[PDB]
């Protein structure tokens, strides 16, 4: 049923509300060779009234993407504003939506992957319900409803106990699967919020993978919206 994935969704996305702010220490894995480069990151999200979230990447290591980093403002409805900061030159760059499908800095993730999840940009179907990982799930497609999305669909494990995503796949314009991302080592935050501190994107047809680490998660440290203005960029 459309209403049965609605309600899922709508479940999932209230479960993970009220969390107010975070700042996590990452690290991000490329395995985009024959073999491995890591990078270490800090990533601030804000949670927007009435909107999605805000996100502000900054790469601190090593010395090639010292600096560089990435401002995202989810919108529920229309495109997210996005820009990226390269210190080089120290030009700001906004990331147009028509081109939101792209890698962003040479990873499995692309621009559209690192906005927040928002009920108003699919359309959602629950399949089936499935045991994976050990955990009963719900299995439920959502279609991006942005015909600039790179994909048509993607499918969703969503454990029935705490409404996290356990796996996504993710397929293509054609129809065909691209890429699986996988979430592991969850934990609770406030007695509520759950975050995956390890993170795996594997695309299939090439087949380079992306893992997302964190080392470290505060929650409601203060932020406020001026910290996600575009003018915080060039520091
Ligand atoms: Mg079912």
Redesign the pocket.
């Known amino acids: 049923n459309a209403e049965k994935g609605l309600e899922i969704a709508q479940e999932r996305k209230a479960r993970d509300e009220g969390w107010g702010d975070s700042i996590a220490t990452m690290e991000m894995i490329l395995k985009n060779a024959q073999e491995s480069s890591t990078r270490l990151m800090r990533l601030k999200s804000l949670e927007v009234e009435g909107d999605g979230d805000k996100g502000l990447t900054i790469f601190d290591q090593p010395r090639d993407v010292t600096g560089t980093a990435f401002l995202n403002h989810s919108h529920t409805i229309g495109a997210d504003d996005q820009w990226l900061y390269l210190p080089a030159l120290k030009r700001v760059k906004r990331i147009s939506s028509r081109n939101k499908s792209g890698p962003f800095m040479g990873s499995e993730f692309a621009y559209e992957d690192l906005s927040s999840f928002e009920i108003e940009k699919y359309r959602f179907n ?1 399949l ?2 499935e045991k994976f990982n050990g955990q009963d799930v ?1 299995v439920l497609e959502q279609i991006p409803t942005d015909k600039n999305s790179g994909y048509t669909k993607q499918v969703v494990w969503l454990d029935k106990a705490h409404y996290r995503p356990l796996k996504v796949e993710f397929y293509d314009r054609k129809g065909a699967l691209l890429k699986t991302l996988t979430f592991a080592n969850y934990k609770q935050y406030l007695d509520k919020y759950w975050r995956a501190h390890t993170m795996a994107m594997t695309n299939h047809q090439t087949g380079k993978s992306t893992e997302l680490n964190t080392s470290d998660l505060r929650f409601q440290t203060g932020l406020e919206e001026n910290d996600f203005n575009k003018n915080v960029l060039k520091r």
């Open positions: 629950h089936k319900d719900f």
